[PDB]
């Protein structure tokens, strides 16, 4: 009764400075899904059909569009897997490093994706900083509604990037 | 001591159908802001600095890009104002009807806006429908983090559009 899902964290180094003083340090992409939840691009895969990577890339093509096709996710991009508590779902986390130019191309092409304005409501970047009040930024972002396993995938990546 | 802010709800009729069966009824744009909260495009205005509408259209250009220059939010687009818990800001709500083509153009050019990846983390459409579980869609979207007055502006618009 176990189902499998794959999700891709696309990221790029970013030298931008919010208000000219807060280092962004990385652009990381999330999608707002049709159900009103934020998560990483991807979804369920039929592991009877091909492999985990084929399933993931299939989903990304529909959600991100042709512009994302040049940046296929491979086995070496696999990071970890996760089981929560609700239904019997194993989520598989992939991280894909892009240049910021490439990540911008993904963002720019997303409006032409088959899913734009349908299964995908839009893309957003994750604010990695915390603002002066100790609440604005990442902590408030994390109070939004998320797809199962998305919070865990993000926090793992932030640890991996030495931002913990 | 009070500050003024202006926000614009940009919307267009959308005949699209999610899963070919759920009427979208309208594309309505929101922004994910740098503080991790959803809001409508716009920001603080300096009152003796310009005008309420001049201040708004200025902010829209920085946040959305040149595609926003294809239209102007006018005095007649004003809907109502709002004061929240705060303190201490008075938010002025404007609603601007676009064609779907115009709205798509705004989305498509957003990554080239001055504020992209800085003050604005990305645009999303509001899901106006409620899924079969009675939770997914609008009800879940409404559980996200919102900037002061944004939830109120949205709900007012939805009732105005007779979508409630």
CA angle, corner B16, sides to B14 and B20, nearest 5? Answer: 160
**Quick one: tokens of B28?**
């309505």
A127 and B35 within 8 Å at the Cβ level: the answer is yes
Q: Do A138 and B104 touch (CB under 8 A)?
A: no
Task: Look at domain B1-164 and name its CATH class.
Answer: alpha beta
Structure tokens at A101: 């130019």
CA of residue B69 relative to chain centroid, distance: 16
User: Are B115 and A119 within 8 A, CB to CB?
Assistant: no
Of A24, A35, A117, the CB nearest to B27: A117
Is A35 close to B118, i.e. CB distance below 8 A? Answer: no
Check: CB of residue B6 under 8 Å from CB of residue B45.
yes
CA–CA separation, B26 vs B17, rounded Å?
A: 11
Phi-psi region of B125 (alpha: psi -120 to 50; beta: other; left: phi over 0): beta
Overall residue count recorded for chain A in this entry: 164
Residue in chain A lying closest to B145 (CA): A144
Q: Label each residue of B53-106 as H, E or C.
A: HHHHHHHHHHHHCHHHHHCCCCHHHEEEEEECCCCCEEEEEEEEECCHHHHHHH
Q: Nearest-CA neighbor of B29 among B113, B119, B95, B117?
A: B95
Experimental resolution (Å) = 1.8
Distance CA B43, CA B56 (A): 7
Short-list A87, A9, A122, CA closest to B116: A122
**Token reading at B65:** 């890009």
Q: Which of B37, B35, B19, B30 is nearest to B136 (CA)?
A: B19
Element at B116 (helix H, strand E): none
Helix (H), strand (E) counts: chain A: 4, 9
B-proximal residues of A, 89-128, CB under 8 Å: 104, 107-108, 111-112, 116-119, 121-127
Q: Which residues of A are annotated as a binding site for substrate?
A: 7, 33, 40, 153
Q: Do A122 and B107 touch (CB under 8 A)?
A: yes
What DSSP string describes B34-58?
A: TTS-EE-SEEEE-TTTS-HHHHHHH
Distance CA A110, CA B63 (A): 18
Which residues on chain B are in Cβ contact (under 8 Å) with A138? Answer: 36
- Angle at the Cα of A39 (from A36 to A43), degrees rounded to 5? 100
The encoded tokens of residue B83 equal 């004061």
B110: how many CB neighbours lie within 10 A of its CB? 26
Phi, psi angle pair for A38, to nearest 5°: -85, 140
Task: Name which of B148, B34, B86 is nearest A22 in CA terms.
Answer: B34
A100-123: buried (b, 16+ CB within 10 Å) or exposed (e) per residue?
Answer: bebbbbbbbbbbebebbbbbbbbb
Displacement of CA B159 from its chain's centroid (Å): 15
Angle (CA) B28-A153-A131 rounded to 5° is 65
B65's CB contacts (< 8 A; 6+ apart) are B106, B109, B110, B112, B113, B114, B116
From chain B residues 24-43, the ones with a CB under 8 A of any chain A CB are 24, 27, 32, 34-38
- Residue A63 half-sphere exposure, CB side, CA atoms within 13 Å? 25
Enumerate the domain spans of chain A.
Answer: 1-164
- Backbone φ and ψ of A31, nearest 5°: -115, 145
Instruction: Mention every residue, 6+ apart, whose C-beta is less than 8 A from residue A153.
Output: A7, A9, A40, A79, A82, A91, A93
* Rounded distance between C-alpha atoms, residue A149 and residue A151, angstroms: 6
Could you write out the DSSP letters of every residue in A85-125? SSSSEEEEEEEEE--HHHHHHHHHHGGGSTTBTTTEEEEEE
Helix (H) or strand (E) holding A62: helix A52-64
Q: What are phi and psi of A122, to 5 degrees?
A: 155, 165
For residue A102 the two structure tokens come to: 């490439």
- Tell me which residue in A34, A107, A125 faces B18 most closely, judged by beta carbons: A34
Spatial distance between the Cα atoms of A115 and A118, rounded to a whole number of angstroms: 5
- Report helix, strand or coil for B22: strand
Inter-chain CB proximity B127 and A35 less than 8 Å: yes
Top residue of B24, B105, B124 to mutate, by most chain A CBs within 10 Å, is B124
């Amino acid at each position: 009764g176990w189902r499998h899902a794959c999700h891709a964290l696309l990221y790029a180094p970013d030298p931008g400075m919010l208000f000219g003083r807060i280092p962004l340090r990385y652009a990381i992409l999330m999608q707002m899904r049709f159900d009103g939840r934020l998560g990483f691009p991807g979804g369920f895969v039929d592991t009877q059909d091909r492999s985990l990577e084929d399933g993931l890339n299939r989903e990304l093509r529909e959600e991100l569009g042709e512009a994302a096709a040049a940046f296929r996710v491979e086995r070496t991009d696999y990071r970890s897997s996760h089981v929560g508590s609700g239904p019997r779902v194993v989520a598989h986390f992939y991280a894909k490093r892009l240049t910021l130019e490439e990540l911008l191309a993904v963002e720019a092409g997303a409006t032409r994706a088959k899913d734009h304005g349908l299964e995908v409501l839009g893309l957003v970047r994750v604010p990695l900083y915390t603002l002066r009040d100790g609440v604005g930024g990442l902590p408030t972002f994390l109070e939004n509604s998320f797809i199962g396993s998305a919070r865990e995938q993000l926090l793992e990546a932030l640890q991996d990037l030495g931002l913990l």
